[PDB]
Write a protein that binds this ligand. Sequence first.
Ligand SMILES: CCCCCCCCCCCCCCCC(=O)O
Ligand SMILES: CCCCCCCCCCCCCCCC(=O)O
Ligand SMILES: [Fe+3]
Ligand SMILES: [Fe+3]
Ligand SMILES: [Mn+2]
Ligand SMILES: [Mn+2]
Ligand SMILES: [Mn+3]
Ligand SMILES: [Mn+3]
Lengths: 285, 285
Amino acid sequence: VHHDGFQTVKATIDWEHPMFKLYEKAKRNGKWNPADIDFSQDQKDFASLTSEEKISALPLVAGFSAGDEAVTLDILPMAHALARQGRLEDVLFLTTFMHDEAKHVEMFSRWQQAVGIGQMDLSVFHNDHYKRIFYEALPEAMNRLYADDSPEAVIRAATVYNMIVEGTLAESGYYTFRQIYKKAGLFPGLLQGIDYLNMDEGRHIQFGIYTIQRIVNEDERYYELFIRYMDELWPHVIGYVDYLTELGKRQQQLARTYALEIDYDLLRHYVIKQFNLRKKQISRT
Amino acid sequence: VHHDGFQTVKATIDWEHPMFKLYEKAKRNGKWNPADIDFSQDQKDFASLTSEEKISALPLVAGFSAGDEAVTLDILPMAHALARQGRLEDVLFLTTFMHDEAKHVEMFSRWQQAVGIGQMDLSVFHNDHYKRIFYEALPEAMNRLYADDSPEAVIRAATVYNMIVEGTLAESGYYTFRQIYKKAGLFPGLLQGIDYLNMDEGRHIQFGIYTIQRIVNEDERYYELFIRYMDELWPHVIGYVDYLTELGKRQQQLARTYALEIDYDLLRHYVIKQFNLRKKQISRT
Ligand SMILES: CCCCCCCCCCCCCCCC(=O)O
Ligand SMILES: CCCCCCCCCCCCCCCC(=O)O
Ligand SMILES: [Fe+3]
Ligand SMILES: [Fe+3]
Ligand SMILES: [Mn+2]
Ligand SMILES: [Mn+2]
Ligand SMILES: [Mn+3]
Ligand SMILES: [Mn+3]
């Protein structure tokens, strides 16, 4: 439908808006290019591994590659809905958000190509719980915004995307990568990429916090919805974590070879801790 | 609706896709930040001008500020429609496209703020022809893609957006800016910004060419649609150009002060030339 006018003709950008400030930071801190990462040592590492060691790393890469691809596609409805509400500074920031996720897809796909597994179908490592989050609940909640941009809908979208997928699962994934392979001295290019992703992610999570809090600020009963939507998804979060844990416990050879005492119970407590601290970053009042 | 799978889990990015190549170039060539442009001399230039000279530059800035704001909002349906078709490399490139346009909005709005006209409503310089393109036909054609992503719809969207708004009007606007103010030695920060915009724009127009040509390649009868949609919009293109020309001829003081023989007939022929050469970049066969 028609534009009735344009904010930067009638006035200017709201230079003090929190999302204009986050946009400015995204530009300053978002120059990294996956095409510049040197994966040559990663190719040698992967080739040096036994078949049993090779498998160890793939479940986590399968979760990230599909996850980054899903969030690249699935942020578009949020950008649309806030655009239609006239939230110009949010939209500007979301152009950095979307471009970040494109680079994330690129990074994991470059790693897979470089180490020689691009032709391998890693979908085998998505269990039913993962599919419920990433194949279903995430696209459902985001696409809803095209026909329903009510405060409830927007809260639910930000909860699933920014607070669960990013703020709980992605953060725990970055922590897991470091805990395992940074210890081993394995895959330096991938770990460089992970550091860049984890930096981008701080802004993504802050968008979600801002968005949920500004709706809760209008009506503190939306706080209860936020908690409810977090708890609805917890069973699939932990069901995926338990599945990856079980895979890790069955395939021990990378841990033994590289003298990693992989503390799966500690990783599980990191996930629980992530989930709970995301809840605490939203104030009921 | 659900994701049935993910290309970068089943396989990898198509590294040879023309739009992955354009994405790669966008990252290499898209580092500029409007926040780094020094507008201090532009503020002094604008203040030094008489009121009659001040007005001269505003119609063109009004056209660009609203135009960049419109295309920032209005590219989202294209990204959605190609995402839903599975065209992952197009989507990756379109994240650079969208972020470019956000910076363009930012750049013009920073200039307006710095020279002291942010509080002025520049909508007065949008005549009926401009409104028909930017307030109506552009959003209509792009939003259509949400419910109709047929080859006809996609061709029409790319024609209005990439071939007319960008490939005809924007290009002619950049040329006009240089012809007038680069001559005068006026507004160095704005002209730095214009050079960056004009560089981004080359990729935007190439997206539109790629998109229209790949549909024409399926069925050369779509070539006739492309020409028809270009000719439908020509009356509003030139009606806006004639309006800006008339404003230029009535307010002569900047030209006299700065010894610019502004050749409005030459600018008009540049627009006609742009329109015709965009037609020629699509091959019927
Ligand atoms: C073995 C302990 C389990 C640790 C949890 C690992 C979760 C893997 C992460 C996969 C989903 C990544 C989502 C990315 C979202 C984004 O890019 O914003
Ligand atoms: C006086 C001669 C007329 C020259 C034509 C000037 C047209 C002004 C341009 C305004 C529209 C700009 C659209 C920007 C689109 C984009 O950012 O991709
Ligand atoms: Fe993210
Ligand atoms: Fe453009
Ligand atoms: Mn289960
Ligand atoms: Mn007319
Ligand atoms: Mn990501
Ligand atoms: Mn532009």
